[model samples]
Target: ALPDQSFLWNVFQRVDKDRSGVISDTELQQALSNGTWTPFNPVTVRSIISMFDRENKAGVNFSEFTGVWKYITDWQNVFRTYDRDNSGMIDKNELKQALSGFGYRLSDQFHDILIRKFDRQGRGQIAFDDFIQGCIVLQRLTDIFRRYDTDQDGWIQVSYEQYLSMVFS
Candidate 1:
């Protein structure tokens, strides 16, 4: 079930330990891992932070946190709907169908790669948590790609130095 707004607020408080009115990268890790910096994907986390940190600041505020919370809730709804068998996991066919329904036309190769990346237990399927995290990661990658397409074309033109700097740091 989705958490209530009040519970989300409490989570924000717990995450923003210093009460700085913002959540830094460290705070975000803590929040995602329930206070332990477990082996979550940093690239995905950074992309999420960049998406919500609209002010170009190094952190996110309550509003941003809530925004992510709402997205997760919405995704959860989608997962429940498509997980027809209720096995708590999604197979290749189901995932393909779900993505198509959601307006994505990913290639089979891409789909397989996504499944491999998110199948943490090597179960050849994706659980709810894996689905959510994978979606976030894919979203972030898309955003990054769009940013580099400065000319509004599908292609991005960058020098070796610029490409390295732009992608890494």
Candidate 2:
């Protein structure tokens, strides 16, 4: 069990009936409709496409789904870091180190968020339930990105001057 396994397994099982471990856009669309998560975005179709279609496939399998899951799960970019050899799997120590990096922010905010939704052992790491909060965070970030990237440059570095001028000028 990964320290931060997230809801990948349940989602995987629900969609991968053929056991091929992959989910097509059609399957994902159905799952999104069934998911109880709210505020359910009518834009779920687009969201699923963005998350699972990175490989340009008609669908996404377990590995592809989890890869996106890991990419934005941690506030500290642990997912990005631990995927060290860039192979997408992190060893045990890597997991622990990532947890340790969470520190005070983890303690006050993310930690409590996890405890509210999961059975985490105070190790500062998280599992899928914890991932709910992370996913919300990522989704919010995604919205903010779209909100700000007026040119769709694919950068999150919003300039303060540009912001103030856009609003005031």
Candidate 3:
């Protein structure tokens, strides 16, 4: 392979310090650095593992780690695009406008609630990792919503049992 990709291969080997041939959250977390140089966001790391763990493995091999790196860079680009204030964080207004740009015009209270879900520090702002996790989770929930709202009647129809199954199953 060329030097560029080989560089990441070396990274995979080095970060896979235990020689498990896979990168777990523990290893991945060590390699990850947030924009503000704060602690790595745990949920974001977990979700990244979940996203690229194609064989249901709890950890990622080198090939999968490459995909993870690409995913992270793509999310970082999106975060940079929306963090218009250049503060490296998404304050309420930036988040609201960013969501609106993504076609999500949630009510004011709903907006606050959504931010609270990912902005766990109660800082009222979202970091890069949190922003990515929020978008991934938001998209996933919307996927489920569309499945139930098949007719797009703006309402979902399901029995209590089915509702429970959707969440519990």
Candidate 4:
């Protein structure tokens, strides 16, 4: 999707201000967008980095940073593509179609719930930052839910503590 590693290498060098051979959340916050040109929220930036930081460290090295770069642009494309009305946000209809493409067979009311959950403003639509976080967290939770269904059926049971541990562990 890009020219080569050299293109990204240059960008990584520019953002890694300390020349520490890694990019931290603070550095990443400055380099990323929240769909409105505002500085990225630090927690969201950390979550994005955590996806590729295989060592589970506080920062991302060259290869991990590459993955981060790709993820941002890819999700940027996703937001833009799904914001069908050019309203700078995604509505329930748009979100439904988008999630459908993402292979989610959710209930019809779920898109409404998603908009209510992620729409920080009262606009009834989602911006880029919320879209990224919502999609990632939903995907992660679905992955975890599938694990609980050990029998591969539509149902499973767990102890009360099991549910608690699943949430914070």
Candidate 5:
């Protein structure tokens, strides 16, 4: 469920230390450790900052934080919906099915790789947090793909050297 505006304001006020009206990286990390947030990786934190730090600022204000909070809650719902057995983890087949339902047609090898990357518990299953991270990565990749599809033909026209250049850059 989404937090009300007042609830979001309370969270923002608490996190925006120094009365700066913005949450810095340090402040955000501290807030996450304050037992009110799910533990998140540094990469995820940075991703959030990058996405919401309008004006290329190094911090996020209450509005941005609220948007991010809503996004995360929505993702949590998605994760729960796909976790059929309520096992707190999704198996390989389930992962593939979930992604397929999201319109991703991943190859077998790529699917295996994704599972390995997110299965940090080494249990051959993906937990909620890992699933969210995977979705973030996929969204970033989709953004890059969209950028490269210059003609909007749903594909890039890069040659072998161009492909290497794109990869390297």
Candidate 6:
């Protein structure tokens, strides 16, 4: 389903808080920077705009904003690959295994709470929406990465230490 035009306009306004009539590639990058923690690169910015900018104008406007929103915000398919059981629920062990596959270990209490909070049916499992909602509750997008674009088994196996080593050493 498409996003409402007014909703699109609202998001555009927030991103263009400087009251700019249009959103350029630089402004779009700045808005994403607020929620994304990383050094901004011009090349990456250009790539992102190329991928999401719908108008073919090489920038984001109200319509383009809605398309991107639907693409990134729709977390329903987040766990399709990870839910190996295909039962549509992700349990604590599954989650732990998922995170550990990446070498990013979470505390037991935190993991349990996260599962419990997201497992709406109390079935000791979380559906894709539940998992996304959990991210919503935590105000975290880390899961967004985990829930998609992960490894074959649906886990982020690339450890940060490994990344650091690969980059520095």
Candidate with maximal TM-score: 3
TM-score (C-alpha) between model 3 and the true structure = 0.87
The 10-residue segment with the lowest total lDDT in model 3: 1-10
Q: Model 6: per-residue lDDT, tens digit, 1-169?
A: 5656787788788777666555777776666431223333444446556667766776766666676566545443445555666665677776776566546557887898887766656767765545555554453445445454456354555578765654452
RMSD of 2: 11.9
Q: What lDDT score is found at residue 80 in candidate 4?
A: 83
| Per-model TM against the reference | 0.63, 0.31, 0.87, 0.86, 0.77, 0.38
For candidate 1, list the clashing residue pairs, or say none.
none
Candidate 1, position 49, lDDT: 83
Supply candidate 2's per-residue lDDT for 143. 66
Off by over 4 Å in 4: none
Clashing pairs in 5: none
Residues 1-169, candidate 5, lDDT per residue (tens digit)? 4558999899888888898888877677666531214465556667777788896788888888887677667776777778788776877878887899899877867878898886667778886667767788887777777788978677677789878866763
CA lDDT of each prediction against the hidden true structure: 0.74, 0.50, 0.84, 0.83, 0.74, 0.60
Order of the predicted models by TM-score, top scorer first: 3, 4, 5, 1, 6, 2
> Which stretches in model 5 have alpha-carbon errors above 4 Å?
17-19, 29-39, 146-158
Q: Check candidate 3 and list the clashing pairs.
A: none
Number of colliding residue pairs in each model? 0, 2, 0, 0, 0, 1
lDDT of 6 at 35: 21
Query: Candidate 1 or 2, higher lDDT?
Result: 1
User: Tens-digit lDDT track for model 3 on 7-69?
Assistant: 889989988989999999888988887776777898789989988988787889989988887
lDDT of 2 by residue, 1-169 (tens): 2534456778677766666666765555455421223222324434555666766665676777675445434433555564355533333444444556543123335445434443233444443333334445445655665787878767656478866654552
